[PDB]
Amino acid sequence: ECLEIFKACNPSNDQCCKSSKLVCSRKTRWCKYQI
């Protein structure tokens, strides 16, 4: 399952939802919308 926004994600294990324009960001420590 993909990770929605504000979801704890790892820099080595990226599993964010691409259909919802979300990407794992180490700055926020979780999935963040792509600017």
Curated annotation (Swiss-Prot):
Phenotype for K27A: Important decrease in ability to inhibit Nav1.2/SCN2A, and no change in activity on Nav1.7/SCN9A
Impact after mutating R26A: Important decrease in ability to inhibit Nav1.2/SCN2A, and no change in activity on Nav1.7/SCN9A
Record localization: Secreted
Residues with PTM Pyrrolidone carboxylic acid (Glu): E1
Disulfide cysteine pairs (residue numbers): C2-C17, C9-C24, C16-C31
Entry comment describing in which tissues the protein is expressed: Expressed by the venom gland.
Effect on the protein of changing S25A: Important decrease in ability to inhibit both Nav1.2/SCN2A and Nav1.7/SCN9A
Site (Binds to the extracellular loop of voltage sensor domain II of sodium channels (Nav1.2/SCN2A and Nav1.7/SCN9A)): F6, R26, K27, W30, K32
Residues that bear Isoleucine amide: I35
Phenotypic consequence of Y33W: 12-fold increase in ability to inhibit hNav1.7/SCN9A, and no change in activity on hNav1.5/SCN5A. In m3-huwentoxin-IV; 43-fold increase in ability to inhibit hNav1.7/SCN9A
PTM: Two forms of huwentoxin-IV exist in the venom of H.schmidti, a non-N-terminally modified (HwTx-IV) and a naturally modified peptide with pyroglutamic acid residue at position 53 (mHwTx-IV). mHwTx-IV shows no observable difference with the unmodified toxin when applied to the TTX-S sodium channel of DRG neuron (IC(50)~50 nM) or when tested on hNav1.7/SCN9A (IC(50)=30.8 nM). In addition, similarly to the unmodified toxin, mHwTx-IV has only a weak affinity for lipid membranes.
Effect of K32A: Almost complete loss in ability to inhibit both Nav1.2/SCN2A and Nav1.7/SCN9A
Comment block on domains: The presence of a 'disulfide through disulfide knot' structurally defines this protein as a knottin.
Function per UniProt: This lethal neurotoxin (without cyclization at position 53) inhibits neuronal voltage-gated sodium channel Nav1.2/SCN2A (IC(50)=10-150 nM), rNav1.3/SCN3A (IC(50)=338 nM), Nav1.6/SCN8A (IC(50)=117 nM), and hNav1.7/SCN9A (IC(50)=9.6-33 nM). It inhibits activation of sodium channel by trapping the voltage sensor of domain II (DIIS4) in the closed configuration. The toxin neither shifts the Nav1.7/SCN9A activation curve nor modifies the slope factor. It does not slow fast-inactivation of hNav1.7/SCN9A channels. In addition, it has only a weak affinity for lipid membranes.
Family label: Belongs to the neurotoxin 10 (Hwtx-1) family. 22 (Htx-4) subfamily.
Note: Shows a weak or no inhibition on rNav1.4/SCN4A (IC(50)=3.9->10 uM) and hNav1.5/SCN5A sodium channels (IC(50)=>10-25 uM). This toxin has also been shown to weakly inhibit Kv11.1/KCNH2/ERG1, Kv1.2/KCNA2 and Kv1.3/KCNA3.
UniProt protein name: Huwentoxin-IV
